[PDB]
């Protein structure tokens, strides 16, 4: 039922990954914005960060 | 509602995020390794990539 884009990127020296520009726009994320990171089932879940 | 590390990082110019070294080791990920990226519910799920 859940579909995944299935896109892979190479890991750079620091172990960082890049979001495709298509997701930068749809996720409303821009430079200097804050991301929050989750950990579940050996998978990493990243979402926009809106502190309350 | 799910439990997560709750750690946030700043977005750099290209819109990239960094995995904490604690997750680099636990996830078995190193430079030049391949990551596969998922998209669900406006959240990004990244997992180790096994070539097929």
**How far is B36 from B40, CA to CA, in rounded Å?**
13
CATH of domain B1-52: 2.10.260.10
Cα–Cα nearest to A24, from B23, B39, B24:
B39
Q: Half-sphere exposure of B25 toward its Cβ, with a 13 Å CA cutoff?
A: 2
What is the CA angle A8-A11-A12, rounded to 5?
Answer: 140
Strands (E) located in B1-52: 7-10, 16-18, 34-40, 43-48
Q: What is the DSSP letter of A14?
A: T
Using CA coordinates, name the residue in chain A closest to B4: A38
If DSSP states are collapsed to H, E and C, what string results for A21-34?
HHHHHHCCCCCCCE
Chain B nearest-CA distance from A42, in A, is 7
Using CA coordinates, name the residue in chain B closest to A2: B40
Residue A44 Cα to chain centre, angstroms: 8
**How far is A21 from B36, CA to CA, in rounded Å?**
16
Determined by: NMR
Contact present, A45 and B44 (Cβ < 8 Å): yes
Element (H, E) at B21: helix B21-26
Residue B31 Cα to chain centre, angstroms: 13
**How far is B45 from B39, CA to CA, in rounded Å?**
6
Task: Name every chain A residue with its beta carbon within 8 A of the beta carbon of B47.
Answer: 42-44
**How far is A16 from B18, CA to CA, in rounded Å?**
4
Measured CA to CA in angstroms, residue B26 lies from A10, A41, B22, B41 at distances of: 18, 11, 6, 25
**How far is B3 from B5, CA to CA, in rounded Å?**
7
Query: Do the Cβ atoms of A5 and B35 come within 8 Å?
Result: no
């Amino acid at each position: 039922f859940m579909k995944s884009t299935g896109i892979v990127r190479k890991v750079d020296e620091l172990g960082r990954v890049v979001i495709p520009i298509e997701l930068r726009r749809t996720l409303g994320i821009a430079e200097k914005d804050a991301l929050e990171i989750y950990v579940d089932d050996e998978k990493i879940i990243l979402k926009k960060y809106k502190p309350n």
